């Protein structure tokens, strides 16, 4: 018995906690941004959106989201905050988005 | 090549979708007479353009739904309901031959 391929499993549970953590931030930031887009705060929503995006691409850097998955979440996020900003638009910061 | 078939729309009753009946002629692999088989495709109609009895080309397409892999290329012949009448009658005989 006792293969030391078991080492692999020990590392699995390491990376599981790495991946799982960054995603949880992503979601918790993404929602946050949208919550202010719906609530018409433009500057704060865009400020948070830039941090969301940064966290997304940073998770693409490694083995969490590596593919165009990160680009998926970005796309959906920018669409949602722009459209939610369409209610009394006033895009104050205008940082994250294009003119 | 994307496969392209020509058939007759026998169903209007969906939304953005039409059923196309496509005949097919081929010699029997053993007995050799020419036999006529036919298949129904669910084709995508985004503009609700095509109506019942129309004879339409249908093109192999990116999957739209379960059971929808074709889109309506163009209109060949407008509204010959004799085809639809053959299909409807044949459907109607099945109410007999049960009990």
């Amino acid at each position: 018995r006792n293969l030391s391929a078991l080492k692999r499993h020990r590392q699995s549970l390491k990376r599981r906690l790495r991946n799982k953590a960054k995603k949880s931030a992503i979601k918790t930031l993404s929602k946050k941004a949208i919550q202010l887009a719906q609530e018409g705060k433009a500057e704060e929503a865009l400020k948070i959106m830039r941090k969301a995006e940064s966290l997304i691409d940073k998770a693409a850097k490694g083995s969490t989201l590596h593919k165009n998955a990160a680009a998926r979440r970005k796309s959906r996020l920018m669409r949602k905050v722009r459209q939610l900003l369409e209610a009394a638009g006033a895009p104050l910061i205008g940082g994250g988005l294009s003119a | 090549p994307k496969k392209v078939l020509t058939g007759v729309v026998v169903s209007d009753k969906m939304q953005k979708t039409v059923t196309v009946l496509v005949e097919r002629q081929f010699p029997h692999p053993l007995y050799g007479k020419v036999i006529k088989r036919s298949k129904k495709y669910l084709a995508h109609d985004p503009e609700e353009k095509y109506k019942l009895g129309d004879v339409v080309e249908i093109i192999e397409s990116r999957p739209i739904s379960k059971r929808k892999r074709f889109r309506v290329l163009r209109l060949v012949e407008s509204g010959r309901m004799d085809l639809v009448e053959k299909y409807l009658i044949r459907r109607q005989n099945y109410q007999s031959l049960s009990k």
Binding site: - | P27, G32, K33, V34
Partner: protein
């Protein structure tokens, strides 16, 4: 209605020769005419000619037979021993140029209908085409 006019003509001829009739009439159709042209050209009949029977057009096929023979059954040998319709309706027979048979190891013909006209098996082979196998004659 006449179901298969060609089988009908083939048969009018078959029966006609079985009683050694001089001639026999078959209802006129261009395709039939083009068949009789091959029968004539290949020496199976004396010939044919257009005619009007009671106002309607027909083809008088003049058949030929061999010599009156010796002791009992003097009846001549036949020139058309065997005529058979091959591709009938409800079971159609088309042959590619490599599917074209050799009829009676050479001594008969297979009338094809080709996109290039009604040919014999030899004509249609050397022409490099196939088509609907109409009938054996030999």
């Amino acid at each position: 209605m006449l179901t298969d006019p060609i089988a009908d003509m083939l048969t009018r001829i078959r029966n006609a020769t079985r009683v050694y009739k001089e001639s026999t009439d078959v209802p006129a159709s261009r395709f039939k005419e083009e068949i009789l042209r091959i029968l004539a050209r290949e020496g199976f009949i004396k010939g044919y000619e257009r005619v009007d029977v009671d106002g309607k057009p027909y083809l008088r096929v003049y058949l030929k037979y061999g010599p009156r023979r010796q002791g009992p059954d003097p009846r001549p040998e036949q020139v058309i021993h065997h005529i058979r319709r091959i591709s009938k309706p409800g079971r159609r027979v088309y042959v590619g140029v490599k599917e074209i048979p050799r009829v009676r190891r050479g001594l008969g013909i297979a009338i094809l209908s080709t996109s290039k006209g009604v040919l014999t098996d030899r004509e249609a082979r050397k022409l490099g085409v196939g088509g609907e196998l109409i009938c054996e004659v030999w």
